[PDB]
Amino acid sequence: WGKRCVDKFDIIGIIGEGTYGQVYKAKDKDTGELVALKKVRLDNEKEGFPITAIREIKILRQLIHRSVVNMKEIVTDKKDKGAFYLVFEYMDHDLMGLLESGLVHFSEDHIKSFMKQLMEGLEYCHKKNFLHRDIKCSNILLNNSGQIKLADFGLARLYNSEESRPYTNKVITLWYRPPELLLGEERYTPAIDVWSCGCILGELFTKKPIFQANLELAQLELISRLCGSPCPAVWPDVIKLPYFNTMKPQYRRRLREEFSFIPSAALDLLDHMLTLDPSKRCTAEQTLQSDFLKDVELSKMAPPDLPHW
Amino acid sequence: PCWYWDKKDLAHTPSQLEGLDPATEARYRREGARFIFDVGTRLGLHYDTLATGIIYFHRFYMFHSFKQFPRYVTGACCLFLAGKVEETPKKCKDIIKTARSLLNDVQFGQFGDDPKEEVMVLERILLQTIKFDLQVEHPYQFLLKYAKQLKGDKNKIQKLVQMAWTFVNDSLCTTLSLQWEPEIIAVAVMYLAGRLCKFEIQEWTSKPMYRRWWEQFVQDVPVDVLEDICHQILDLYSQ
């Protein structure tokens, strides 16, 4: 459909300061219900239309999934100094904020229904040959009706299984970054998104992130202390990485030991998601079939106890 | 969004509604498309980036008149946007420099006295006109894909692709991109080049007995369609 309508949206309040413009909260006059508006200005920049926004638009029009934030429309104001607004389906909360407060604790069945929706979204993105390349707790949107959506596709890119594609190194940000990127991998796989989800899966059970460091060398050490040092026995192709011999932290994999409280079915997933070798790591399709998420019937799940703030 | 009209609709474009000669608009589209092709070539751009801009250009003037919007300014704006979409971006400043070198004093007058602001402003309109449907595919992709499934003389098949490639570049100077899908155009230029070189393309397919070889690439396309696309391409060389 045509995307060039005037702001017939009644703005409620500013949500924050996202990429290339403030994000407003509003509700359109005709339909009803809430809507998020990502503002994109042209009068600020000699970029004309910002290219970073262009890739996001090109990707979101091709991703249509129940557990992925879908771009509804693009609207305007109206030789003028106007601005565009990206229309997204409004989500009340995000996983990071809910865990920041000591108010919200998730049951075992909440996490199941959550991890299900998340990985079901990734499988859709990975089958469409897209890398998220920025999966984190803040980029996961959750509403008051149990529904979960994956957001922020700015750093997303197209992937080719023909291995004819070297990409960017600085990806995912430090805390949730896979071991391959920390060692200088550029031609990677969708397995980098799985590692991030693994760092989120463990986060849910521990309320706080599992790997918190300020330096990249330090970050590798934290992963090593829990997942084991990058040995060729555990990871044969680790020697083909530029920063292997220069970032040596040996450690025994004490992952199952430090996550004893986690259920046996849940720990089996967390163990397979957080394997060092990308080629020897669980994929998106595989994680939806593990013990902790294979039987999870979404329609039989009851919505969480999320409070409106 | 549906991006395909018929010749009856093409005979009633916003340009011709303002009293523009149908033969003149055809000339304006030729000049405009070839302009984007030239400016992008001197900047060493991907052949898809060129075609992406041209399709933006053709689609733009299905909703706007040439009498209200100067073609060379719009073409430069299309090429600029296409560079960012196809992720082979060029600075807007360097597009104008290239434009000044190719255009004469009269033609460059369309950019006024501040070409950059003239192009930047138009981008807001261009994005709205194309309804933010940025991603487009071109006959080039399917031309190579279809040709890579032909079993025969490597020398003759290679020549078929070369001529077909040329015809695709020519089709961008026409309203064909507004008429038929890239898959059909890719076939049509193979049909044309085949008939010119007396190549029996069917004898290179899995079923050499069957005469309509193209029915294994595109569905439900009469020989009338392929013949029509040829004649629109052939009249470019005609005067």
Residue numbers in the entry:
A (entry chain C): 719 to 796, 804 to 974, 977 to 1036
B (entry chain A): 22 to 260
Provide the authors' original text about this structure.
Human CDK12 (CrkRS) and its close homologue CDK13 (CDC2L5) are unusually large CDK family members (1,490 and 1,512 amino acids, respectively) containing a central kinase domain with flanking arginine-serine-rich (RS) domains. Recent work indicates that these CDKs regulate transcription via assembly with the 65 kDa cyclin K1 subunit (herein CycK). Here, we report further structures of CDK12/CycK complexes solved in the presence of AMP-PNP and containing variable truncations of the C-terminal kinase extension.
However, diffraction quality crystals in the monoclinic space group P21 were obtained when the same complex was phosphorylated with CAK. In the more truncated structure, the electron density was most complete for the complex comprising chains A and C. CycK (chain A) was modelled between residues Pro22-Gln260 and the bound CDK12 subunit (chain C) between residues Trp719-Pro1031, with the exception of two regions of poor electron density between Gln797-Lys803 and Lys975-Lys976, respectively. Similarly, there is very poor or no electron density for AMP-PNP in the structure of the shorter CDK12715–1038 construct, further highlighting the importance of the αK extension.
